[PDB]
Amino acid sequence: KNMLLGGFDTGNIKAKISFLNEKGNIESFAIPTVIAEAPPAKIKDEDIELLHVRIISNSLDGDARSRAWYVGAYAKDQEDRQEPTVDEMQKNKKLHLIPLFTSMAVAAARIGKEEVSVPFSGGMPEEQILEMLYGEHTVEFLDGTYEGKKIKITINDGTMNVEGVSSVLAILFDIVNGEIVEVEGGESYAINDLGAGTSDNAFFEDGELNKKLSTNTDLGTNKYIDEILKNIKERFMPFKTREDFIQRLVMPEVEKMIEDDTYKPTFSVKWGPVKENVTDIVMDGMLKYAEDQKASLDKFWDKTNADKNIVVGGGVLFGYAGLRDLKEQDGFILPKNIQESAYFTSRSYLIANLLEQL
Numbered sequence: 001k002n003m004l005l006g007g008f009d010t011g012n013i014k015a016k017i018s019f020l021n022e023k024g025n026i027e028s029f030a031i032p033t034v035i036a037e038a039p040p041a042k043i044k045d046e047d048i049e050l051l052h053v054r055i056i057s058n059s060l061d062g063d064a065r066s067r068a069w070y071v072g073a074y075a076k077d078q079e080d081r082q083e084p085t086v087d088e089m090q091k092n093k094k095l096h097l098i099p100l101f102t103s104m105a106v107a108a109a110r111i112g113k114e115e116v117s118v119p120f121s122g123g124m125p126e127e128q129i130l131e132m133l134y135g136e137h138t139v140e141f142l143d144g145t146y147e148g149k150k151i152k153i154t155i156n157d158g159t160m161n162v163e164g165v166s167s168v169l170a171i172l173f174d175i176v177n178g179e180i181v182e183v184e185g186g187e188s189y190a191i192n193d194l195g196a197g198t199s200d201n202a203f204f205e206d207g208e209l210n211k212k213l214s215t216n217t218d219l220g221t222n223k224y225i226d227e228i229l230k231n232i233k234e235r236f237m238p239f240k241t242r243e244d245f246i247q248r249l250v251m252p253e254v255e256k257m258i259e260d261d262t263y264k265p266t267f268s269v270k271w272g273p274v275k276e277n278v279t280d281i282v283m284d285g286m287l288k289y290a291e292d293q294k295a296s297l298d299k300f301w302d303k304t305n306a307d308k309n310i311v312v313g314g315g316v317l318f319g320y321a322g323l324r325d326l327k328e329q330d331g332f333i334l335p336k337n338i339q340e341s342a343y344f345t346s347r348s349y350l351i352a353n354l355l356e357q358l
């Protein structure tokens with residue numbers, strides 16, 4: 001006890017966590033990989049909307065030893081903001097450490113604990129990276145829902161879930177108080193994690209990750225989202241972030257499509273004194289993404305000739321209109337609790353973590 005049980009899925013867009021709440025169920029959220037330097041003091045998922053925290057950790061160095069930061073969404077609106085840099089084709093570690101530690105703190109505050117030991121269950125694209133996380137980290141909230149709260153994080157042990165079925169555990173198992181099998185259900189399989197800026201095409205063969213064939217591409221949803229937003233604004237001539245677009249406009253329609261196959265979705269945007277029906281625009285981009293993913297998945301199927309192909313990530317949901325065809329394809333496996341497809345990997349790491357502590 002006094003222990004936070006979580007799976008940690010960190011990328012360049014978001015830092016994702018799936019953890020056990022007080023009622024023993026899985027709780028998931030994400031913190032954008034964005035930080036900004038902040039003054040020592042104050043100036044669904046509401047508690048992460050304003051993250052102004054002080055972090056004391058030996059995993060940080062230089063003029064970041066022990067100071068205050070704006071983290072995630074609230075950092076994105078700062079001129080100072082630091083984001084992952086990408087060429088036209090470490091020691092930026094605080095970009096990843098800070099949102100990571102922050103997510104641990106937020107989770108701890110959610111379950112009402114001030115001091116948590118956190119066995120690290122994550123993944124990488126081992127011990128060298130784990131030792132970068134070892135030690136004691138204090139996170140103090142200077143604003144927001146948990147203002148004045150001080151959380152002491154202790155990371156003694158961990159794993160990066162490299163080999164075995166650890167990465168795929170969420171395809172078969174859930175945690176409802178703990179620890180049950182999924183309501184519906186080979187030796188060589190591919191896990192395709194369809195993400196925002198990336199697509200992870202991993203191939204597991206005989207209990208082993210095939211490090212040769214396991215590839216990673218920039219085939220994400222963001223480019224297709226960008227295009228849709230270009231055509232919407234152009235249709236008028238609205239949304240602050242892509243997440244805003246996904247949350248306010250897309251997610252409600254996708255959920256309706258999930259829980260009822262006869263439902264045809266509608267997309268209308270209210271901008272100024274004008275309201276436009278842009279259903280055709282959004283659907284075009286969705287299917288374009290689906291078709292492109294269909295093509296990408298097939299040629300990876302052929303390259304590995306895996307027995308089964310598992311498709312996960314938020315891309316499954318964003319392109320559900322087209323990608324739901326995979327449910328009637330033998331050799332393709334969509335998660336059955338498809339509503340939780342975005343947090344598949346972090347949920348897998350969480351389940352692997354609970355099994356470790358048993």
Ligand SMILES: Nc1ncnc2c1ncn2[C@@H]1O[C@H](COP(=O)(O)OP(=O)(O)O)[C@@H](O)[C@H]1O
Nearest residue numbers: 014195196221246251254313314315317318342
């Ligand atoms: N329920 C949903 N409906 C529609 N789109 C979603 C849903 N959940 C996530 N997405 C979208 O799917 C894309 C992939 O998200 P995700 O896999 O979480 O990215 P990453 O793992 O790279 O951070 C994102 O653009 C996200 O906005």
Ligand SMILES: [Mg+2]
Nearest residue numbers: 009011193195
């Ligand atoms: Mg991801």
